[PDB]
Amino acid sequence: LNEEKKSKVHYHVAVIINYLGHCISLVALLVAFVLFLRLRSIRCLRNIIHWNLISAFILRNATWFVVQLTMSPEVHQSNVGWCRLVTAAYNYFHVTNFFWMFGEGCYLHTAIVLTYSTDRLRKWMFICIGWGVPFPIIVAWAIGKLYYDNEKCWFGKRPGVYTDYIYQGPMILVLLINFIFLFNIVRILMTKLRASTTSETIQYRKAVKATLVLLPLLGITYMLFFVNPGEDEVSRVVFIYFNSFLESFQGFFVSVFYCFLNSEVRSAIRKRWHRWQDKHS
Amino acid sequence: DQRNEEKAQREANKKIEKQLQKDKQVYRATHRLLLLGAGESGKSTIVKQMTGIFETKFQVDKVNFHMFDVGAQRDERRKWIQCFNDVTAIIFVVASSQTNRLQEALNLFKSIWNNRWLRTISVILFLNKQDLLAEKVLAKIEDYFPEFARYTTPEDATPEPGEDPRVTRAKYFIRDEFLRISTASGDGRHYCYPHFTCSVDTENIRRVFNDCRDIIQRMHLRQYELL
Amino acid sequence: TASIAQARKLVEQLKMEANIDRIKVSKAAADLMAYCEAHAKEDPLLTPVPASENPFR
Amino acid sequence: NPSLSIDLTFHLLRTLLELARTQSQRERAEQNRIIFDSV
Amino acid sequence: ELDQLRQEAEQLKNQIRDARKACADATLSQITNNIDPVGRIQMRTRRTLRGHLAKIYAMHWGTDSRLLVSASQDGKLIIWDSYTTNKVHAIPLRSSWVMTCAYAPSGNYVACGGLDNICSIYNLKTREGNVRVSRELAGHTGYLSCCRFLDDNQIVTSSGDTTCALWDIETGQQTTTFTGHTGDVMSLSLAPDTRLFVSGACDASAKLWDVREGMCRQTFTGHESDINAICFFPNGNAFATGSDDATCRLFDLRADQELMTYSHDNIICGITSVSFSKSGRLLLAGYDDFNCNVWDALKADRAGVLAGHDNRVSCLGVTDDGMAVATGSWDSFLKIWN
Amino acid sequence: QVQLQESGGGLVQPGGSLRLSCAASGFTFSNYKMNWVRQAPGKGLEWVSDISQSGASISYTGSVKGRFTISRDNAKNTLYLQMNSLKPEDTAVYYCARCPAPFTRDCFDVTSTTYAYRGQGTQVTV
Ligand SMILES: CC(C)CCC[C@@H](C)[C@H]1CC[C@H]2[C@@H]3CC=C4C[C@@H](O)CC[C@]4(C)[C@H]3CC[C@]12C
Ligand SMILES: CC(C)CCC[C@@H](C)[C@H]1CC[C@H]2[C@@H]3CC=C4C[C@@H](O)CC[C@]4(C)[C@H]3CC[C@]12C
Ligand SMILES: CC(C)CCC[C@@H](C)[C@H]1CC[C@H]2[C@@H]3CC=C4C[C@@H](O)CC[C@]4(C)[C@H]3CC[C@]12C
Ligand SMILES: CC(C)CCC[C@@H](C)[C@H]1CC[C@H]2[C@@H]3CC=C4C[C@@H](O)CC[C@]4(C)[C@H]3CC[C@]12C
Ligand SMILES: CC(C)CCC[C@@H](C)[C@H]1CC[C@H]2[C@@H]3CC=C4C[C@@H](O)CC[C@]4(C)[C@H]3CC[C@]12C
Ligand SMILES: CCCCCCCCCCCCCCCC(=O)O
Ligand SMILES: CCCCCCCCCCCCCCCC(=O)O
Ligand SMILES: CCCCCCCCCCCCCCCC(=O)O
Ligand SMILES: CCCCCCCCCCCCCCCC(=O)O
Ligand SMILES: CCCCCCCCCCCCCCCC(=O)O
Ligand SMILES: CCCCCCCCCCCCCCCC(=O)O
Ligand SMILES: CCCCCCCCCCCCCCCC(=O)O
């Protein structure tokens, strides 16, 4: 009937990677959440967008733990309702995470390129484009799975059925936008560096550092090795390990770089540590 | 009895919060500038082309700029210049040239650039009287500076055609005299933008517009810890 | 010949400030000590106040 | 059968569930071979 | 004609210095050895008033210890309620740069001034429901640095043209003028009986002016840099000055010299605002190292540290009953320490 | 009380040398960067030179470069200025001025009309 593959010894180990970094991602993200509950003098719009992105990563990782705990072949055989509920909630939080990375990219592009149009942005537009726009997409996906393909907890893939792409259609399109803006930003960054740096070595190093910091924020790590060619070979192992490491450590990298290595947040932590030292001493 | 007074104070607080939100939306759109210079610099033609303080409201491409000009004050500048700590730019206008004016301008720019509270505000430099430099070079810049004869013309910039080599040599010498004390202890938090202007020129407003755009872009790159 | 009037005003100001009777340092210090020690009971910043009398809690 | 990097979670879930199904299928075939050897 | 007058002035200064050395019996630190020290002062931030956009530059408490004004450089003068943290009033200003503000002892008028050289007096008798510019005082040739009310009719102002003035609110003319300084008069402090007032300038000197006579009484020169703030003792016989050389100095009016010098090795930041408590034991000093210090006025020992601000603390005020301390810094945040 | 006393001057021959002394009393000498500023008859004040707190950063005006020597003694509490190879243009009233703030580099109001942290000055006629 069927024959086992030689990549099986790899596969479970990759799952162990998904059990490692996601856990320490919480050890970043929730802690970062507490920072945005304490520091009230940092309430500009940029920190609000970053805090909403951290909340989206927290909800996605918590729903991912729920997914990895409540799935079994006995639940996969018979189509139960809460299985479809957990699948729809995970897809909703994933689309919400991508639209908040879109909000990060739109705010950064409207902060650097359209410099004089930065005050036109308001908080309610980003809230309604982050938490609002995924709702009709997930409702349309639920209707399409209710009427076309309603087997195997709505995530079983049948050939000739393209009902999954109705939630994957805009996302990669969003990801396309998250490429293009970044390119323009890098151009403007060069327009600063050549003005401010007299050494070729320093400016390229700072541009590479800014690019490697900005890549996990906009989520362009998914576009690094995106489509498998299709041949049953060792490229599937590279696909699984590369995408598993990036999807597990993306939220950790975003949280650490934008919270713990920021100068204002470190200065506020040093001020509060001196206040606690003066109180205890 | 106290419930009605508390409800009246809550309604007054809601009205004042709505008015302050509208005033915040008005306030964060306008960009404010500080025009500063000497007496013989020629700021009158500058304010005619584009009381204690002088107000100037204008707009370019639907972007409101409010310029503040210091008027009936004294020479004691060490107490009120701390008030201009949240402006986006200090437009420092001096004229190239009686007492020595350029050394006083260099000392004033050195005191502004090395101030404790003026480490975040960028200075847009303007050299106003270039025609006076072209007229006074024919029949006094070599007397006050002994390093004017032992100075080479910078080749990294393109000079305007139809001019004497001594005029552009003195121009870039004054530019390098400002950039020596400008590029000494800057450390990337605040920058200087030297420019060359004349009397009848309407291209200065676009220069101030582009320089303030560069200042806000460098501020947003500083807040993201990219630059 | 413009600062001569300012010099005359400074001379007259020093002559007005010269003829005074300066009180001793120890007597004024004891007066400030007695004033600071007498009003020590009604200082809400020196002595910590309870939650009832404090309107800011 | 194209897959995407974004849908990596459900891809790993489908591979793990298909591996569990073929493992249970091999276990049931082993039990059936025990029944055939006994009876 | 100048050499003889300068030598006569030097001889008179030498006579004043010899008289001050002859009247100096003993220091205060030698006789305050048997005094019980204060100890650790723990003041927490009870209320936090966040309604300003630009930097809060000045504030003043009311007579009823409940309402307080706060002026910012965005063009706002907000009258806050300290108990129920509600905004009672918000006055938009004509000139956006305002360096000082005042509150009436009766609670009816509010003054403000800045770089426009005009003292604007607003009335809080809202017959129509909205506040309006009740008066404008324009007779100074320099920036208005500080202003305080004597009563509902008179107002003492200090300007940056080395002059102080006494204005009548009804007529609009200077009653008397004060011209004895050579630098910018940074601040002034009225006496509790409203008879005399001190004024410190940028020549490291504080002069004691009379309101009724209109001439200087005494001069105090004990600092090394610009005197930024001054405040009276609660009885009205001594005062304390804060300067830019990170040293505070408590002077006496009767002894005509300094009594105490407050300094420390780690403090290299100038003082912005000084204010005593109600009794006179604690002395509050707002430095430029993002925190305030509570000194013991009798033993010169730093008792407390008020560290809750992010930027330069510009204004500090103590209410009349001594219940709380309002500090306002350049991060647009008022904090009510208690 | 802050007091600055100047010493030296007098009518000398052109091309000769001279030495000005500045005695300070009433403050800490090792905290303030100090300046020499001259005022010509019939003209305004103009800045001559300055020395920092430690004495490492010494700067001059271009018209007085290589001919003036400004030094300071923190223990002896004094400020010296050696002037060799003079010119008949240097006849002025000289002042030793103090910057108003300690532990800083900026000096705003040194060359001003009414500044109180400078001495009475000395007359040098060449
Ligand atoms: C249980 C295992 C994973 C160890 C967890 C360590 C946790 C409990 C520790 C380590 C780092 C700590 C944080 C360090 C800094 C701050 C900023 C402060 O303003 C709020 C508390 C907060 C957020 C601390 C909360 C407790 C904390 C999160
Ligand atoms: C916002 C998202 C995370 C909400 C997800 C709802 C989750 C937390 C709830 C809703 C239905 C719940 C399930 C209800 C029934 C069962 C059957 C039991 O034998 C195992 C637990 C399990 C499977 C529960 C697990 C938790 C569960 C899946
Ligand atoms: C709005 C976003 C979060 C998507 C929500 C999807 C979930 C909560 C909703 C949308 C469609 C709903 C389904 C509609 C029809 C049926 C058939 C019924 O015999 C069993 C329940 C079941 C299967 C419902 C279960 C819950 C359901 C799957
Ligand atoms: C899909 C099911 C299982 C879970 C759905 C969770 C939804 C209902 C919850 C979780 C997170 C919530 C959002 C959290 C934050 C905000 C910002 C606030 O200013 C407006 C409401 C808003 C936008 C909430 C709307 C409701 C919300 C989106
Ligand atoms: C460095 C960060 C991004 C983590 C990336 C881990 C990568 C570099 C490592 C971890 C697991 C490794 C794989 C382990 C096993 C194999 C099978 C072998 O026949 C080909 C190489 C290959 C496919 C390795 C390629 C490199 C690899 C994917
Ligand atoms: C901190 C690093 C965590 C991630 C590290 C992942 C590395 C996994 C490598 C597994 C190699 C297995 C090779 C098996 C060879 C075979 O039998 O086919
Ligand atoms: C595990 C915790 C999950 C929390 C999910 C809900 C997140 C709520 C986010 C609230 C955003 C509010 C933005 C405005 C903040 C403000 O300036 O007051
Ligand atoms: C806002 C909507 C929230 C929806 C929460 C879940 C409601 C639908 C759950 C469907 C469970 C179906 C279980 C089997 C049906 C049955 O036979 O009883
Ligand atoms: C911004 C719009 C993005 C939406 C993309 C629309 C294309 C959806 C493709 C799948 C639609 C459902 C197809 C069901 C299978 C069928 O063809 O019968
Ligand atoms: C306009 C939005 C673009 C979003 C991209 C979504 C991609 C949808 C692809 C649908 C392909 C349908 C082809 C069916 C062919 C067939 O019948 O076999
Ligand atoms: C934006 C989408 C781009 C998609 C690009 C897909 C490129 C696929 C390349 C596959 C190469 C596989 C090589 C395997 C070599 C090996 O056996 O190790
Ligand atoms: C090697 C991976 C470790 C993962 C650790 C996750 C939690 C990190 C917490 C860091 C808190 C930093 C707080 C500020 C430190 C400081 O600069 O004073």
Short mmCIF file of N, CA, C and O in Angstrom, two decimals, chain A residues 44 46 50 104 107-108 111-113 115-116 118-119 122 185 188-189 191-193 195-196 206 209-211 213-214 217 258 261-263 266, chain B residues 21 24-31 61-63 65 188 191 208-218 220-227:
data_model
loop_
_atom_site.label_atom_id
_atom_site.label_comp_id
_atom_site.label_asym_id
_atom_site.label_seq_id
_atom_site.Cartn_x
_atom_site.Cartn_y
_atom_site.Cartn_z
N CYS A 44 4.03 56.72 21.60
CA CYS A 44 3.90 57.16 20.22
C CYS A 44 3.25 56.07 19.37
O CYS A 44 3.06 54.93 19.81
N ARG A 46 4.33 54.48 16.68
CA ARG A 46 5.22 53.40 16.27
C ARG A 46 5.24 52.27 17.30
O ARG A 46 5.17 51.08 16.94
N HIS A 50 3.95 48.37 16.93
CA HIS A 50 4.79 47.26 17.37
C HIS A 50 4.13 46.43 18.46
O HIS A 50 4.26 45.20 18.48
N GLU A 104 3.16 47.69 9.61
CA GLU A 104 4.54 48.11 9.90
C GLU A 104 5.23 48.65 8.66
O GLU A 104 5.87 49.71 8.70
N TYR A 107 3.59 52.04 7.59
CA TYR A 107 3.99 53.13 8.47
C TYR A 107 5.45 53.51 8.26
O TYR A 107 5.79 54.70 8.29
N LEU A 108 6.32 52.53 8.00
CA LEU A 108 7.72 52.85 7.75
C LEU A 108 7.91 53.56 6.41
O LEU A 108 8.70 54.51 6.31
N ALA A 111 6.69 56.96 6.76
CA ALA A 111 7.56 57.75 7.61
C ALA A 111 8.84 58.18 6.90
O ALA A 111 9.36 59.27 7.19
N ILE A 112 9.37 57.37 5.98
CA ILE A 112 10.63 57.72 5.33
C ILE A 112 10.42 58.41 3.99
O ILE A 112 10.91 59.52 3.77
N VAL A 113 9.69 57.76 3.08
CA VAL A 113 9.47 58.29 1.73
C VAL A 113 8.56 59.51 1.76
O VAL A 113 8.99 60.63 1.46
N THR A 115 7.54 61.84 3.71
CA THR A 115 7.91 62.45 4.98
C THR A 115 6.88 63.46 5.47
O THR A 115 6.52 63.47 6.65
N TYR A 116 6.39 64.31 4.58
CA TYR A 116 5.43 65.33 4.98
C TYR A 116 4.02 64.80 5.14
O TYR A 116 3.15 65.52 5.63
N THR A 118 3.27 62.07 6.98
CA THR A 118 3.25 61.15 8.11
C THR A 118 2.14 61.47 9.11
O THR A 118 1.64 60.56 9.78
N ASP A 119 1.74 62.74 9.22
CA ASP A 119 0.69 63.12 10.16
C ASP A 119 -0.70 62.79 9.64
O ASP A 119 -1.67 62.87 10.40
N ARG A 122 -3.54 57.84 11.04
CA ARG A 122 -4.18 57.79 12.34
C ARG A 122 -4.12 56.36 12.86
O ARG A 122 -3.81 55.42 12.13
N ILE A 185 13.22 51.94 0.56
CA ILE A 185 13.81 52.37 1.83
C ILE A 185 15.32 52.23 1.78
O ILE A 185 16.05 53.16 2.16
N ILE A 188 16.81 55.06 -0.11
CA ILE A 188 16.86 56.28 0.68
C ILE A 188 17.95 56.16 1.73
O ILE A 188 18.66 57.15 2.01
N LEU A 189 18.18 54.94 2.23
CA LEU A 189 19.24 54.73 3.21
C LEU A 189 20.60 55.00 2.60
O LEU A 189 21.46 55.63 3.23
N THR A 191 21.08 57.11 0.20
CA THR A 191 21.08 58.56 0.05
C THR A 191 21.44 59.26 1.35
O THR A 191 21.92 60.40 1.33
N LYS A 192 21.33 58.56 2.49
CA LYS A 192 21.86 59.12 3.71
C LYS A 192 23.33 58.77 3.89
O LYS A 192 24.15 59.65 4.18
N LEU A 193 23.68 57.49 3.65
CA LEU A 193 25.01 56.98 4.01
C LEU A 193 26.11 57.65 3.20
O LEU A 193 27.11 58.09 3.77
N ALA A 195 25.94 60.55 1.97
CA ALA A 195 26.05 61.90 2.51
C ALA A 195 26.83 61.92 3.82
O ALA A 195 27.60 62.85 4.07
N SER A 196 26.64 60.90 4.67
CA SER A 196 27.16 60.98 6.03
C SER A 196 28.40 60.13 6.29
O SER A 196 28.99 60.26 7.37
N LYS A 206 26.78 49.09 7.48
CA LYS A 206 25.57 49.59 8.11
C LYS A 206 24.32 49.30 7.28
O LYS A 206 23.25 49.04 7.85
N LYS A 209 23.58 45.65 7.95
CA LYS A 209 23.02 45.52 9.29
C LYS A 209 21.56 45.98 9.34
O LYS A 209 20.71 45.31 9.93
N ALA A 210 21.25 47.10 8.67
CA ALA A 210 19.87 47.58 8.64
C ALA A 210 18.97 46.65 7.84
O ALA A 210 17.80 46.46 8.21
N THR A 211 19.49 46.04 6.77
CA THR A 211 18.70 45.09 5.99
C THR A 211 18.42 43.82 6.79
O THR A 211 17.28 43.33 6.80
N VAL A 213 18.31 43.59 10.00
CA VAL A 213 17.35 43.90 11.06
C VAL A 213 15.94 44.04 10.49
O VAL A 213 14.97 43.56 11.08
N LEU A 214 15.81 44.66 9.31
CA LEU A 214 14.49 44.94 8.77
C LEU A 214 13.83 43.74 8.10
O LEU A 214 12.61 43.74 7.93
N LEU A 217 11.18 41.87 10.45
CA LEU A 217 10.03 42.71 10.80
C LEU A 217 8.97 42.65 9.71
O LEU A 217 7.78 42.47 10.00
N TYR A 258 13.48 44.82 18.38
CA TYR A 258 12.71 46.05 18.51
C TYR A 258 12.35 46.41 19.95
O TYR A 258 11.83 47.51 20.18
N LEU A 261 17.00 45.69 22.37
CA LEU A 261 18.16 46.39 21.83
C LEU A 261 17.85 47.84 21.45
O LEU A 261 18.72 48.51 20.89
N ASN A 262 16.65 48.33 21.75
CA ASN A 262 16.33 49.72 21.50
C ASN A 262 16.97 50.60 22.57
O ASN A 262 17.08 50.21 23.74
N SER A 263 17.39 51.80 22.16
CA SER A 263 18.13 52.68 23.07
C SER A 263 17.21 53.32 24.10
O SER A 263 17.60 53.47 25.27
N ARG A 266 16.15 50.58 26.68
CA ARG A 266 17.27 50.30 27.58
C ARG A 266 17.52 51.45 28.54
O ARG A 266 17.84 51.22 29.71
N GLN B 21 -7.29 67.40 21.55
CA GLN B 21 -6.99 66.47 20.46
C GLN B 21 -7.00 67.18 19.11
O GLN B 21 -6.12 66.93 18.27
N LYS B 24 -3.89 69.22 18.98
CA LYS B 24 -2.74 68.36 18.73
C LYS B 24 -2.63 68.00 17.26
O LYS B 24 -1.52 67.98 16.70
N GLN B 25 -3.77 67.73 16.62
CA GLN B 25 -3.77 67.46 15.18
C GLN B 25 -3.37 68.69 14.37
O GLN B 25 -2.78 68.55 13.29
N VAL B 26 -3.68 69.89 14.86
CA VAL B 26 -3.20 71.10 14.21
C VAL B 26 -1.71 71.31 14.49
O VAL B 26 -0.94 71.68 13.59
N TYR B 27 -1.28 71.03 15.72
CA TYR B 27 0.07 71.39 16.17
C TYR B 27 1.14 70.49 15.56
O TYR B 27 2.22 70.97 15.21
N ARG B 28 0.86 69.20 15.44
CA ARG B 28 1.89 68.30 14.92
C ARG B 28 2.03 68.33 13.41
O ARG B 28 2.92 67.66 12.87
N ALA B 29 1.19 69.09 12.70
CA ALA B 29 1.32 69.23 11.26
C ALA B 29 2.22 70.40 10.88
O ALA B 29 2.95 70.33 9.88
N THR B 30 2.19 71.48 11.66
CA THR B 30 3.01 72.65 11.36
C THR B 30 4.45 72.43 11.82
O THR B 30 4.69 71.88 12.89
N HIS B 31 5.39 72.87 10.99
CA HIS B 31 6.81 72.78 11.30
C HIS B 31 7.33 74.17 11.65
O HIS B 31 7.11 75.12 10.89
N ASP B 61 3.71 73.32 -0.85
CA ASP B 61 3.08 72.03 -1.15
C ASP B 61 2.16 71.58 -0.02
O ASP B 61 2.17 70.41 0.38
N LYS B 62 1.37 72.54 0.49
CA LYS B 62 0.39 72.34 1.57
C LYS B 62 1.04 71.81 2.84
O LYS B 62 0.49 70.94 3.53
N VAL B 63 2.22 72.33 3.16
CA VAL B 63 2.94 71.99 4.38
C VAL B 63 3.23 73.29 5.11
O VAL B 63 4.00 74.13 4.62
N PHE B 65 4.71 76.02 7.42
CA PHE B 65 5.95 76.38 8.09
C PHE B 65 5.74 77.70 8.82
O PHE B 65 5.26 78.68 8.24
N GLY B 188 26.72 62.42 14.92
CA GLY B 188 25.56 61.89 14.22
C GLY B 188 24.20 62.26 14.77
O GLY B 188 23.19 61.96 14.12
N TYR B 191 23.14 67.60 12.58
CA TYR B 191 23.95 67.89 11.41
C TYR B 191 23.83 69.36 11.03
O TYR B 191 22.98 70.09 11.54
N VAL B 208 15.21 75.23 2.12
CA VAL B 208 14.77 75.02 3.50
C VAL B 208 13.81 73.83 3.58
O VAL B 208 13.87 73.02 4.51
N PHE B 209 12.95 73.69 2.57
CA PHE B 209 12.00 72.58 2.50
C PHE B 209 12.72 71.23 2.39
O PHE B 209 12.43 70.30 3.15
N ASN B 210 13.70 71.14 1.49
CA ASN B 210 14.45 69.90 1.31
C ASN B 210 15.33 69.59 2.52
O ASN B 210 15.49 68.43 2.90
N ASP B 211 15.90 70.63 3.15
CA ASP B 211 16.74 70.40 4.32
C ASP B 211 15.92 69.94 5.52
O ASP B 211 16.35 69.05 6.26
N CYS B 212 14.73 70.52 5.72
CA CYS B 212 13.87 70.05 6.80
C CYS B 212 13.35 68.64 6.53
O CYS B 212 13.18 67.86 7.48
N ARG B 213 13.12 68.30 5.26
CA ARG B 213 12.77 66.93 4.91
C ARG B 213 13.90 65.96 5.25
O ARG B 213 13.66 64.87 5.78
N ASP B 214 15.14 66.37 4.98
CA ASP B 214 16.30 65.54 5.32
C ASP B 214 16.45 65.39 6.84
O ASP B 214 16.80 64.31 7.32
N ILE B 215 16.15 66.45 7.59
CA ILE B 215 16.21 66.40 9.05
C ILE B 215 15.18 65.43 9.61
O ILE B 215 15.50 64.60 10.48
N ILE B 216 13.94 65.48 9.11
CA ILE B 216 12.90 64.59 9.62
C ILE B 216 13.17 63.14 9.20
O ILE B 216 12.91 62.21 9.97
N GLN B 217 13.73 62.93 8.00
CA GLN B 217 14.09 61.57 7.59
C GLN B 217 15.22 61.00 8.44
O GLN B 217 15.18 59.82 8.81
N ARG B 218 16.22 61.82 8.78
CA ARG B 218 17.28 61.33 9.66
C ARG B 218 16.77 61.10 11.08
O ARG B 218 17.25 60.19 11.76
N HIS B 220 13.63 60.01 11.79
CA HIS B 220 12.92 58.74 11.73
C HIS B 220 13.86 57.56 11.55
O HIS B 220 13.55 56.45 12.01
N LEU B 221 15.00 57.75 10.89
CA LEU B 221 15.99 56.67 10.84
C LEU B 221 16.71 56.51 12.17
O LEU B 221 17.18 55.41 12.48
N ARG B 222 16.81 57.58 12.96
CA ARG B 222 17.40 57.47 14.29
C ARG B 222 16.46 56.74 15.24
O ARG B 222 16.92 55.96 16.09
N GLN B 223 15.15 56.96 15.11
CA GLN B 223 14.20 56.32 16.01
C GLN B 223 14.07 54.82 15.76
O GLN B 223 13.73 54.07 16.68
N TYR B 224 14.33 54.37 14.54
CA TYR B 224 14.32 52.94 14.22
C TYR B 224 15.66 52.27 14.43
O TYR B 224 15.75 51.05 14.24
N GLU B 225 16.69 53.04 14.82
CA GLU B 225 18.07 52.56 15.03
C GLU B 225 18.61 51.90 13.76
O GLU B 225 19.23 50.83 13.79
N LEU B 226 18.33 52.52 12.61
CA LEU B 226 18.85 52.08 11.32
C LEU B 226 20.10 52.85 10.92
O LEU B 226 21.10 52.26 10.52
N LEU B 227 20.04 54.18 11.01
CA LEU B 227 21.19 55.02 10.70
C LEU B 227 22.04 55.25 11.94
O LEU B 227 21.51 55.41 13.04
#
